[PDB]
Paper text:
Proteins from the bacterial small multidrug resistance (SMR) family are proton-coupled exporters of diverse antiseptics and antimicrobials, including polyaromatic cations and quaternary ammonium compounds. Representatives of the ‘Qac’ (quaternary ammonium compound) subtype are proton-coupled exchangers of quaternary ammoniums and other hydrophobic, cationic compounds.
We were able to obtain diffracting crystals in the presence of five structurally diverse compounds transported by EmrE: monovalent planar aromatic harmane (3.8 Å), divalent planar aromatic methyl viologen (3.1 Å), quaternary phosphoniums tetraphenylphosphonium (TPP+; 3.4 Å) and methyltriphenylphosphonium (MeTPP+; 3.2 Å), and quaternary ammonium benzyltrimethylammonium (3.9 Å). Although the crystallization conditions varied for each substrate, the TPP+-, MeTPP+-, benzyltrimethylammonium-, and harmane-bound proteins crystallized in the same unit cell as proton-bound EmrE3, with one copy of the EmrE3/L10 complex in the asymmetric unit. For all substrate-bound structures, the maps show positive densities between the substrate-binding E14 residues, including a four-lobed density for TPP+, a three-lobed density for MeTPP+, and oblong densities for the harmane and the methyl viologen structures. For the other substrates (methyl viologen, TPP+, and MeTPP+), this comparison showed that binding site sidechains, especially E14 and W63, adopt different rotamers, thus accommodating the differently sized substrates. Likewise, the position of the W63A indole ring rotates over approximately 80° depending on the substrate that occupies the binding site. For the Me-TPP+, harmane, and benzyltrimethylammonium-bound structures (pH 6.5, 7.1, and 7.25, respectively), the contribution of a substrate+ proton-bound population cannot be ruled out.
Residue numbers in the entry:
A (entry chain D): 4 to 92
B (entry chain B): 2 to 103
C (entry chain A): 2 to 104
D (entry chain C): 3 to 92
């Protein structure tokens, strides 16, 4: 159910500004966690969290040209499956 | 005055425990913040209404008007039934609140 | 075992409430931290009893033992600040409590 | 027999003053000391901020050099004792 609709708004070769639909007031969670790593897997992935009232987040420090996989998890798996996408910088 | 804030803290906690049942594990941000704000207020409301009314006296009245307002709010617009012998137990708590009141 | 965590959570809240009388509007460190700690314990214990003991009997015991433990603790550390018509009013509040929970 | 006690200026600086005080015994420790600082002349209000009652030190920045300031440390209520106030020229 939440989060819903994960897409990349602005895209710099080394940064991706993403966003999602945080739900709606009474379905706002306390925090989302965002996971970005290389689409391959030669190394681990990078991760951070965002408060539940914010719907956007910036991902900095990427490598240009590389395709990345970005995932946004709810606090728990009870709010629906985590939504994931791909982007080539 | 003292039995006004005690009831305001009773109303505060009852709203706190209900908003907690609505939110999940403090995950739903809005009713989670509602529970934190309610408990903080009721913590500071009970703290200020204890210097006047004795400790054991206010514990009783709370346990009273709490479940009163809990089961009243329960039958109010949530579920219903439960083990309802009658509202005779609700009228008991009211009496003790009165004969301890002003 | 699962019935003990109640009385411990009862007593922990019993201790925290008496410690709140020492916090001075949460303006005195050590009692203020203590009340926050005490209530974190009774929470965690009560949450460990809701998984086994029903909510009705677990709480009816809480109201009774608590209204006895904190009221007796308010006699040694203090005594009475504004006693009024009846002490039995609290026992009959506790009575009406036990008959809208158990009954 | 009041708190706080012994309000002294540890480090100084034209634009900053590091200060400390005697929080008293473990039963005399409060939860928040509110501290006030303004100009000695008194042609202005007085800046104020709080600081956790488990810390006996407080740093103040944004001061104007050469000026003499008056610093006062309060308690949550006036029940703990008269607040302690001092002076210092940066
Ligand atoms: C201190 P109390 C409480 C009050 C207000 C907000 C949140 C909690 C409480 C309320 C009414 C009557 C007796 C005690 C509590 C705390 C931990 C575990 C069980 C109860």
């Amino acid at each position: 159910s939440v989060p819903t609709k994960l897409e990349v708004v602005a895209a710099t070769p080394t940064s991706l500004l993403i966003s999602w639909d945080a739900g709606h007031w009474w379905e706002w969670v306390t925090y989302y966690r965002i996971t970005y790593g290389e689409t391959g897997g030669n190394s681990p992935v990078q991760e951070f969290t965002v408060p539940g009232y914010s719907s956007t987040a910036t991902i900095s420090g990427l490598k240009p040209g590389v395709d990345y996989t970005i995932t946004v998890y709810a606090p728990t798996s009870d709010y629906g499956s985590p939504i994931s996408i791909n982007y080539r910088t | 005055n003292p039995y006004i804030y005690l009831g305001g803290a009773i109303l505060a906690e009852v709203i706190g425990t209900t908003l907690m049942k609505f939110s999940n594990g403090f995950t739903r941000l809005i009713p989670s913040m509602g529970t934190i704000i309610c408990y903080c207020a009721s913590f500071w409301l009970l703290a200020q209404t204890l210097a006047y009314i004795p400790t054991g006296i206010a514990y009783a009245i709370w346990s009273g008007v709490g479940i009163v307002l809990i089961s009243l709010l329960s039958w109010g617009f949530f579920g219903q039934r439960l083990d309802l012998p009658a509202i005779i137990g609700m009228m008991l708590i009211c009496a003790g609140v009165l004969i301890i009141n002003l």
